[PDB]
Amino acid sequence: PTMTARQRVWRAFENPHTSTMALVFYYVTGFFIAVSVIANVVETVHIKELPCGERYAVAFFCLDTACVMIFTVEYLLRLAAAPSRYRFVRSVMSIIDVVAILPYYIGLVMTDNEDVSGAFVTLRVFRVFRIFKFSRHSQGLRILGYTLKSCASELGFLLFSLTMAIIIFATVMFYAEKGSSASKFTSIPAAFWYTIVTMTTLGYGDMVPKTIAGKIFGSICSLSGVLVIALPVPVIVSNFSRIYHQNQ
Amino acid sequence: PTMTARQRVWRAFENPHTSTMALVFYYVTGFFIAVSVIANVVETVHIKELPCGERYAVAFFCLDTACVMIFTVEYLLRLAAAPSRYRFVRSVMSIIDVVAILPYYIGLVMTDNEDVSGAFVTLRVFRVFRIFKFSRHSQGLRILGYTLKSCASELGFLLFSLTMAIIIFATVMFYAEKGSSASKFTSIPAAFWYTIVTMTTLGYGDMVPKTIAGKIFGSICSLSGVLVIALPVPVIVSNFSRIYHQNQ
Amino acid sequence: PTMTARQRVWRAFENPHTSTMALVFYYVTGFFIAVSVIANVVETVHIKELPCGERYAVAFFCLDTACVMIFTVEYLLRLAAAPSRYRFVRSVMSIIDVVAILPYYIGLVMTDNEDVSGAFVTLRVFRVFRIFKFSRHSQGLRILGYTLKSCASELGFLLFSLTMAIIIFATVMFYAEKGSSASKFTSIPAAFWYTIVTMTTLGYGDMVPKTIAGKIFGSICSLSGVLVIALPVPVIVSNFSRIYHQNQ
Amino acid sequence: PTMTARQRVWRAFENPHTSTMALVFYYVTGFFIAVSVIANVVETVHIKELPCGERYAVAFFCLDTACVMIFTVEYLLRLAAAPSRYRFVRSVMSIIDVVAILPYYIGLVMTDNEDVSGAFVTLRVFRVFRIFKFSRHSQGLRILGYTLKSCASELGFLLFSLTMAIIIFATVMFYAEKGSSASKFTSIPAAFWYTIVTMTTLGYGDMVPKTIAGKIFGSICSLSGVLVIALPVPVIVSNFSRIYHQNQ
């Protein structure tokens, strides 16, 4: 550390298992992320069965912003130790941090002038994206992201073949299960749900074929789901085994 | 290109990533196929909740035939550049193209003189087989077809063993779940649906055993389904990994 | 063929792809087995909706016995060409043949003097075991039998661990889902069905947990089902790949 | 055996396939373990449909205490033949032995002074943990325990990644399926049940999405369940095959 504090605090940020301040910072950031997400889960769950976010959610507000505050300041700390400050901002981790921290300020701006319920649930949904801040803490998430980036073509073919099979089988089932007495196959988009439930070997029973023609193609769909889905599964797993092993 | 335009346009057809006209033709064919299938999906989805194919389906007609028209002319182009014209027609891709383009003309001939609903749904089902025209655009579908052709014996054994197990377990369940109060196991063909749902580990709950004898054999069927199905799954996937890798 | 017809007809029986009489015998035996099983399936499927086995089942009788007759005589032929006649009888294929042919004669003896319905459904269940007579025709069935015999210890451990996990999870679910309003977990044996449905990732929805304690252990059971079942799955498949490849 | 009886009876305990006294002790303990767990299952299955534990449980209590007494005395014999008696107690095998016999003695103390139903079912739940005493008899269970310990990090990542996906998908599903007419997605913890069932490709149909937004994310959850769960499955199986093979 022959120069200013930037590099000697960045080495603590980049390597949290060294020194003692880095470990404390790592633990406190992890604890704050965990407590924030647990608080969100808890607040999601007499005149009525009022949830824990109407009579409460004063402290659940302050607590939340406290966590957010910490995130902001630590992000500022990560802006005070980056030789590649602009490139660091362009990095995926900085993007995840910004996506995690923006909802609170966006909601504050929205509630400063007027208030609408259209972005309320949207912002609350985006608020859970602070789970992904555990990527720094856990190596497994980084390995999973690396594998998903590596086999990008395999996921593309997975999506393309899945959409193709879904369209084909939904069309077949809709045209084979249209004249039933009480049929839920009102359209091909309404048969997309049944096709994706059957292909993944999930099964729900809400939408089932009630015709001989629809049962024959309702069982081939299940077999074709195994064939289509299980082609890119090994390559994702093999990449995970290869990348994780090569890091050792 | 020392000779006529046939070979110099076939090199563009066979290789769409070369030149600039070939890329435009490839993109326009892909876009037309996609818009045709999306139009079919959309048209499949006050006096009544009238779908988008009764008040509409004038433009949905013309649009459709426009796509069909393009297919026809491009097929004619593929007939103007094939040194193996007859052999090219005998190829699988040409068969797929004719299967995709025939429904429209067949329906026109049928509606020219009288009209019946027997072939209406059949032709509408056949119309979605222009999805398979994406085989030229996507290498993954070609690899999948090559693998399915290569491991033809394993698929045959899959079908044979699946039919054998289905027959055995359907007979056992029908004769074990026949005397129930309100039983849907009226016959072995009526137990084929339950057997194929249970073997594929899908589960629907519409048809479940309600007897101790039927529950014992209704759980062995689920385990036997995993054993039977998972034998040819690796060989299909291994061939896909081998063929795709050997192309690189 | 320097000696009597026994060996020169056994070489046709053992090798059905040689000569021309052996191929005809192989095809006729396969056709008779297939028509017998199809006849059983069909006969299993106004005053009432009478099945095809009450107004019918005279020709369905004669047809059936005809098939049985053929089996008997061909078995006699296999007794006229075996140098190891006693050892051949001790073979698994001969046991399968006797198991397939006995039901008819046993039923004839039973119906000769009095008649009971206790053994009626049992004999009809045993009647489908002529499906296994396709082992001679299909090499895949023989390979599957060889693999199942080879990894006998792995199937034993599969059964033991499956029973252990089923007992543990059924006890936990019964004692966690006992005090519900309308609970189908009346006893530990009654929770065996739910446990085996959940472990195999099948799902039916007839028996589901309705308590927080029962839901936590109702989801661990599903994960533990994947772990237990997927341990002997590769070894069965790997043996199938190894044995089938080594035959080539 | 140049010294006292401790070692010459310990070799029978550690190696039950040697001599003849060890084999008798090996089978007699397994029979009493088997009959104990069967009795626990059986006891759970006019004024009312009284189970077999109220009119009975005068012979069952004697039967149960007979098994426990054998378990205790054989544990004491293992304490009279262990050179590492203090270390042997700390072993995992001895821990299971104490856990198997503790509920019976704790229950006797509990019922001596007053009686409560809070620990009545809790002690009965612990009573099935004598199933794990089969680890000595079965080599597969010992290997299964070794492989779960070997890949402890992979299971640690499985729990962390699964909690990651469960929380992320439940939050999306809860907010997308909240304004339905009769929705069971009352809260994120109430949506944890749906997520874990969907991810494991199980399917129950009690909780299903009824909105277009909830169906899109209700199908990605099923695909993401396969991706997350199938990462540590091969390493558990590969370790099991490797450890089992290296034992031979």
Residue numbers in the entry:
A (entry chain D), B (entry chain A), C (entry chain B), D (entry chain C): 163 to 207, 215 to 417
The authors write:
Modulation of voltage-gated potassium (Kv) channels by auxiliary subunits is central to the physiological function of channels in the brain and heart. Native Kv4 tetrameric channels form macromolecular ternary complexes with two auxiliary β-subunits—intracellular Kv channel-interacting proteins (KChIPs) and transmembrane dipeptidyl peptidase-related proteins (DPPs)—to evoke rapidly activating and inactivating A-type currents, which prevent the backpropagation of action potentials. Here we report cryo-electron microscopy structures of the Kv4.2–DPP6S–KChIP1 dodecamer complex, the Kv4.2–KChIP1 and Kv4.2–DPP6S octamer complexes, and Kv4.2 alone. Thus, our data suggest that two distinct modes of modulation contribute in an additive manner to evoke A-type currents from the native Kv4 macromolecular complex.
The fourfold symmetrical structures of both Kv4.2 alone and the Kv4.2–KChIP1 complex were determined to an overall resolution of 2.9 Å by single-particle cryo-EM analysis with C4 symmetry imposed. The transmembrane domain of Kv4.2 adopts the Shaker-type topology, with the S1–S4 voltage-sensing domain and the S5–S6 channel pore forming helices composing a homo-tetramer in a domain-swapped manner, whereby the S1–S4 voltage sensor interacts with S5 of the pore domain from the neighbouring subunit. It adopts a depolarized S4 up and S6 open conformation in both Kv4.2 alone and Kv4.2–KChIP1. The C-terminal intracellular S6 helix continuously extends from the transmembrane S6 helix toward KChIP1, which was not observed in previous studies. In addition, the intracellular S6 helix interacts with the T1–S1 linker in the structure of the Kv4.2–KChIP1 complex. In addition, the open conformation of Kv4.2 complexes revealed several Kv4-specific residues involved in the intra-subunit interactions between the S4–S5 linker and S6, as well as the inter-subunit interactions between the S4–S5 linker and S5.
